[PDB]
């Protein structure tokens with residue numbers, strides 16, 4: 427019953443999920459002047475060359491491109507992380523308009539969308555166990571702005587017709603997530619949470635400073651998705667983002683001077 431409407435949206439989540447008001451909630455505003463460069467942060471290691479995508483799913487909140495995470499095939503390492511985190515899925519959050527849509531903000535600036543590459547700590551055996559741990563997940567966040575098209579996003583865009591409504595899925599093999607990365611891997615990092623219910627406080631957030639550009643046509647196709655199931659009243663899947671939450675007792679660290 428939670429969602430993003432006037433009656434079930436982020437302001438309501440705390441009633442079913444009291445951790446919504448917790449001590450390490452995401453997303454947050456990234457105050458670029460207050461984030462501290464941390465020279466002890468390792469370079470980030472993104473190893474996606476062996477990635478195996480399987481499926482794309484409209485889950486009624488966003489769409490997930492899911493990966494085979496039954497072996498170490500696509501991993502995130504280094505940066506603030508100890509150990510090996512395996513890619514399980516990626517998805518996006520986006521707006522009804524180019525001026526909003528991202529979950530994280532940068533000096534209060536909202537981007538048109540935000541990509542989340544979700545990884546789980548292999549020390550915990552599977553995703554389900556990992557989300558119960560303070561260091562269970564690493565989500566790589568990448569901002570999208572509207573400008574030139576992102577060629578590597580287009581295979582995703584073109585399959586969206588086939589998963590228009592909640593619960594629809596489609597085969598989605600041989601998609602290469604390296605096509606969605608910016609040039610630079612400079613990042614901010616802080617400890618936080620899933621940004622949707624159950625809002626578990628299990629994520630090390632790694633948010634890239636460099637946005638990717640997508641075209642107006644690409645983002646328009648995101649906005650044609652539906653929150654509803656087939657044969658239900660059409661509600662466009664837009665504004666599926668949670669706003670910035672209080673930073674509280676946390677420091678955001680920068681990987682770069």
Ligand SMILES: NS(=O)(=O)c1ccc(-c2cnc(C(=O)N3CCOCC3)o2)s1
Nearest residue numbers: 514515542544553565619620621622623
């Ligand atoms: N916006 S976010 O913070 O990146 C995020 C919010 C919720 C996520 C979630 C929950 N379950 C999964 C998942 O991929 N699985 C694993 C178990 O639940 C169903 C499928 O992802 S990922």
Ligand SMILES: [Zn+2]
Nearest residue numbers: 517519542621
């Ligand atoms: Zn997300």
